[model samples]
Target chain A: MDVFMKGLSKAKEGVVAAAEKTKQGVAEAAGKTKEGVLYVGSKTKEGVVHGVATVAEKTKEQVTNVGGAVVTGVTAVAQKTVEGAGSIAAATGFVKKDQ
Target chain B: MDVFMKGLSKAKEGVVAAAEKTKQGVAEAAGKTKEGVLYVGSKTKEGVVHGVATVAEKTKEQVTNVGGAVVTGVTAVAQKTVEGAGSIAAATGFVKKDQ
Candidate 1:
């Protein structure tokens, strides 16, 4: 009878130990999950910021290209207008035509 | 004008490179999160199983204790009943008491 009681007593102890172990294991998992979240969050933010910065830089350069093209076009038109005025002056005797 | 166009072209290339980097970084974060989750998930299961095993073992032991207590109780009762019968037989002269 005593032996039987001892068996049950030992079993109770085993259960307590098991409970303790389970608690620790779950806590460990929780901690790891939190750590992973933080890591992933930072990495994602970093990537997005870098992408945005690059995009902003590219936009500036593209606008500059448009401005340069406009200037080039205006310069060509101005030269043509001046040339036509000079021909009109020569026809009106405002220029010596090898007289 | 040519220089301006070249400037814009180079900026576009920068944006492409930056985009590639961003993709890689995000992918890396995703992979790590998955890996961590897998690891944590497995660990949790392992711990829970161990705890359950311990609990099962303890339950068996406790049941054994109950069985033992029952047997011990029965043995005591049997001895008392037998003693009472022997006393009755002696009183009825069914037992040789050195007569």
Candidate 2:
């Protein structure tokens, strides 16, 4: 066998080792992202559940419990109501600080 | 200087080099996260703004453009309307698939 053939074989193995390390890194990164997604998904669902309840409760109270008025009341205060609901979610630890 | 002392100094420098590499890794990770956040934030805002518009448009049309009826029409279809709006946002590329 030529000397160059051995050198080339060693170089190929080194490249394969590097590739394996990169593959491991990619798998680790993917695992971290999956964890992030699960955290976000759960937090969002919890946040929305509490958000709707608090907004409905407060809107009803704010409108003095008139059924028809409460409907429109929710519309008028939609933006701020969402803000309030989000704040409540964050305060209650149902929200994540990062995306 | 003693041989052991010189070895100790070199070891300390090696540790500092390792620390510097770790710090660079941390900074790189932070920068990546910041980019992710910006992408998520902008996409969310874009998604929500378009979500409201599409839902309002569809609900208005579905309710036959009745002024008072559109309000309640929106409520009745709230869940599906949100789903539709989100789908629209995703289809239009105003939303991120990752976050």
Candidate 3:
């Protein structure tokens, strides 16, 4: 009876050791997961900012192009207006009056 | 002597069982981590795409506002050009004979 009790005690010790090791392993894995989540969150924020900047640059370029076209069109019309004024003045005896 | 040898054998068995259980626990934890990584990766990709689209929409609106301003500026210039042309023609007697 004494021998049987001894064996049971040893077996119990073995089980306790195994269980403790398992608990430690789980704790370590959970710690790693927490760290990974934090790292990914930071990286995602950076990506969002970069994406916004890229879009803004492209939009600025498009706006600049449209502005340039409008300016060119206005300048062309101004030149034509000047030429028309000259022609009208000449026809009305304003420049070199007819005898 | 036989009793001591038997005790040694039991101890060896206990150690092997503990090692096996530990190995299984580690394997299961690793599998869970792999699945978690896949799930998180998909979510991150979705977030990145959503962020890009949001930026794109905002950029388009900004460009439209800038384009409107450019158009307004050009219209003002056009109006001034016409007025200047009329004044020059009037001064040169292009529309009427000089008295």
TM-scores for the candidates? 0.12, 0.14, 0.18
Off by over 4 Å in 1: A1-99, B1-15, B19-47, B50-52, B57-99
CAPRI tier of model 3: incorrect
Per-candidate iRMS values, in order, are 54.3, 24.2, 43.0
**Stretches of candidate 2 above 4 Å error?**
A1-26, A30-99, B1-44, B48-99
lDDT of 2 by residue, B1-99 (tens): 222211113111121100111110110111011123222222231211101121221121211122222122112111112111121111010112233
lDDT of 3 by residue, B1-99 (tens): 223221223322242112112321111211111123323333332222211123452344443222322221111112133323343221111122245
C-alpha-based local distance difference test score of model 2: 0.17
Clashing pairs in 1: none
- Model 3 error, position B49 (Å): 3.4
Q: Poorest 10 consecutive residues of model 1 chain A by lDDT? A: A16-25
CAPRI verdict (incorrect, acceptable, medium, high) for model 1: incorrect
Q: Report backbone clashes per prediction.
A: 0, 0, 0
For the second chain, the TM-scores of the candidates in order are 0.15, 0.14, 0.14
Give the per-residue lDDT of model 3 (tens digit) for A1-99: 123311223432132111212311111211121123323333232232211223443443432223322221111122233333422221122122244
Task: Assess candidate 1 and give its TM-score to the true structure.
Answer: 0.12
- Chain A TM-scores for all candidates read 0.15, 0.14, 0.14
Model 2: pairs clashing at backbone N, Cα or C within 3 Å: none
